[PDB]
């Protein structure tokens, strides 16, 4: 009676239904959970925002053209201004969170294309200057909601001003590894003849037990167009990719006044 | 070994200690609790901000002169901009909350004075105009953190503009009942020879099971100077009254975008 | 509606409502449509980053051609009134293109959709009165 293509996911007061889905990837075979008492790093009383922040948040819909080359989001910081998870984050020094990334892109049965949806632990990217090394600013490394785009050309700016940003090169995947090897990460491929949604379940992955979300970006969401979009009547059409992310099993420590980072 | 004058109250990550306290008043003999399932009005999933908003919040310290006539705070709206309880409030349509009001005022052993600290259910006050009835604006009825003051003179402004505010008359207690009868409320008296702190424990009191905190103000905190401050060398001294309030056992319903009320 | 005519014989009502939406487009027309319910007491939602924060449902188009957005009973009073009253206001409801609806060639672009209303099994009324349709 049941099928693998119809899936409803509910967290808090938010619901995603999908009728042409592929199967869901639990990353590295572990469902996210709270910090156990045998591994706890801080000793303060942890805040568990039970349903106020364990819910789906819908980002901005980027448009996937025929010349679109890729997108990237840093995952505990693309939700920095989303409801109460953006208010649980900056009022606390520590924070761990599991995730349910759901990437939404659909077309007709006459379109074609592929979207490698990745989820990269410690997605450290390269700077866009050759004056200095490991050299990216804070605003350019943490865009938040809008994310960033990749590029099919590496043009390092000789200015140290405009070179403090990610040299988001698509075939080297930012960090100088080939993109055809990126399938060792937890990944799904949106193929516009088979499916229309990619669902990943991401546990908290870090060397520490719990860490500052304001400093440290745990996961990296990556969407690569493997085969470009090609619609035969209108070759320059645009189908939107909408990313909907939920925090899961969040836990925070060290309450204080609000942290407001710089914007420039 | 133990005494009634030394009391530590801890909620969340906040602590009040006091070494010259009187006994604490649990209002109407009931400790505050969550909404039971046999009385629940909404059917959505309730948000329980377990430790993020059940903690002590310190308001602004008003100065109690020899000519100070009284103060008033509306209790679920004096905390409207306090941490996450001000963020749990405006992102939800429903809200119930117990309270732990702790009023802090201390002097030497040479001062004298009395402070009737009250807690009035449905503290409906009178308007300061005789053009219309039941006629108060929103900003003038809900000051928030700073509260309001009483006055020993009733001057109704003939303008309907400047008359949309509380006619805070002290001996008629705002609502036209005599102030000497206000001891039928849960009350404590700060007496500067006996104690220096007034602690009340206020359950959620409303006809409904749960109600909008943005519309409806449940309790009214009232501090009346019964006997005025009198310090014999300096007759015009000022000792500060600091009010420290904690929400207790909060529960919220109906999540949506943020409510931002008008400011003028 | 049939629900609205019975409620105009009564005064006080409680319970949740059921909005079942029938898509009457073509077969090849695929799409996703957001269906949202926002409880009252804030800005009425106009853009999609205001109605995602409420109680919503993301509906997909295909074989099963009827969704159901439920408006739950989220209310201060036990009984809302059967008038336009400010104190017993109900909620704000919108409907957004989730991604968009895509049609191929040889298929109409402008389509239509039907919208229903009923009552959940916890819906009940009180206080019979006259109505205001007929004179």
């Amino acid at each position: 009676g049941y099928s693998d293509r119809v899936r409803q996911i509910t967290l808090g007061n938010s619901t995603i239904t999908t009728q042409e889905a592929a199967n869901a990837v639990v990353a590295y075979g572990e469902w996210p959970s709270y910090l156990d008492d045998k591994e706890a790093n801080p000793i303060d009383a942890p805040t568990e925002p039970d349903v106020s922040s364990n819910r789906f948040y819908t980002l901005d819909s980027v448009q996937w053209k025929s010349t679109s080359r890729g997108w990237w989001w840093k995952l505990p910081d693309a939700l920095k201004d989303m409801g109460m998870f953006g208010q649980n984050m900056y009022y606390h020094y520590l924070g761990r969170s599991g995730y349910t990334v759901h990437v939404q892109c659909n077309a007709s049965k006459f379109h074609q294309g592929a979207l490698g949806v990745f989820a990269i632990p410690e997605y450290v990217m390269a700077c866009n200057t050759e004056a200095k090394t490991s050299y990216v600013s804070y605003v350019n490394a943490n865009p938040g909601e809008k994310g960033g785009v990749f590029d099919n050309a590496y043009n390092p700016s000789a200015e140290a001003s405009e070179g403090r940003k990610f040299a988001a090169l698509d075939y080297l995947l930012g960090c100088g590894v080939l993109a055809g090897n990126a399938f060792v990460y937890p990944h799904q491929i949106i193929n516009l003849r088979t499916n229309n949604s990619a669902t990943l379940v991401l546990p908290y992955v870090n060397s520490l037990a719990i860490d500052c979300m304001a400093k440290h970006n745990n996961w990296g969401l990556v969407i690569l167009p493997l085969c470009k979009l090609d619609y035969a009547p209108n070759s320059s059409t645009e189908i939107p990719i909408t990313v909907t992310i939920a925090p899961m099993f969040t836990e925070f420590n060290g309450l204080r006044n609000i942290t407001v980072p710089a914007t420039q | 070994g133990y005494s009634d004058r030394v009391r530590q109250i801890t909620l969340g990550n906040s602590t009040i200690t006091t070494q010259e306290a009187a006994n604490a008043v649990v209002a109407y003999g009931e400790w505050p609790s969550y909404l039971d399932d046999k009385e629940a009005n909404p059917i959505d999933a309730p948000t329980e901000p377990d430790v993020s908003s059940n903690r002590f919040y310190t308001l602004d310290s008003v100065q109690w002169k020899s000519t100070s006539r009284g103060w008033w705070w509306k209790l679920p709206d004096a905390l409207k901009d306090m941490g996450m309880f001000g963020q749990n409030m405006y992102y939800h349509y429903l809200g119930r909350s117990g309270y732990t009001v702790h009023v802090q005022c201390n002097a030497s052993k040479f001062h004298q004075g009395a402070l009737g600290v009250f807690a009035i259910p449905e503290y409906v006050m009178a308007c300061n105009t005789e053009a219309k009835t039941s006629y108060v604006s929103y900003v003038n009825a809900n000051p928030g953190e700073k509260g309001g003051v009483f006055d020993n003179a009733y001057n109704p402004s003939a303008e309907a503009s400047e008359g949309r505010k509380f006619a805070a008359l002290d001996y008629l207690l705002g609502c036209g009942v005599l102030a000497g009868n206000a001891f039928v409320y849960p009350h404590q008296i700060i007496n500067l020879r006996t104690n220096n702190s007034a602690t009340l424990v206020l359950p959620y009191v409303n006809s409904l099971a749960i109600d909008c905190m943005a519309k409806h103000n449940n309790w009214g905190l009232v501090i009346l100077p019964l006997c005025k401050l009198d310090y014999a060398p300096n007759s015009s001294t000022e000792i500060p009254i600091t009010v420290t309030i904690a929400p207790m056992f909060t529960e919220f319903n109906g999540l949506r975008n943020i409510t931002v009320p008008a400011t003028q | 509606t049939m629900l609205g005519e019975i409620l105009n014989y009564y005064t006080h009502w409680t319970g949740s409502l059921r909005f079942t939406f029938l898509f009457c487009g073509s077969m090849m027309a695929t799409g996703k449509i957001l269906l949202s319910y926002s409880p009252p007491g804030a800005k009425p939602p106009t853009t999609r980053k205001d109605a995602m924060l409420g109680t919503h449902i993301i509906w997909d188009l295909g074989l099963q051609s009827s969704c159901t957005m439920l408006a739950p009973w989220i209310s201060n009073t036990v009984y809302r009134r059967c008038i336009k009253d400010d104190f017993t206001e109900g909620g704000y409801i919108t409907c957004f293109y989730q991604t968009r609806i895509v049609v191929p060639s040889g298929t109409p672009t402008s389509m239509f959709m039907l919208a229903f209303v009923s009552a959940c099994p916890d819906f009940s009324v009180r206080l019979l009165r006259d109505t205001n349709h007929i004179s």
């Binding site: 119809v6 899936r7 239904t17 | 629940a40 999933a45 | 079942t20 099963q64 051609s65 159901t68 099994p121």
Partner: peptide, 26 residues
């Protein structure tokens, strides 16, 4: 009485009650 409301939590499964078909008459 009218029906009560059970304490339920979130789901992620193939059992989908939110989708009906009013062509069937129900």
């Amino acid at each position: 009485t009218a029906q009560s409301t059970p304490l339920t939590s979130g789901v992620n499964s193939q059992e989908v009650p939110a989708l009906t078909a009013v062509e069937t008459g129900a």
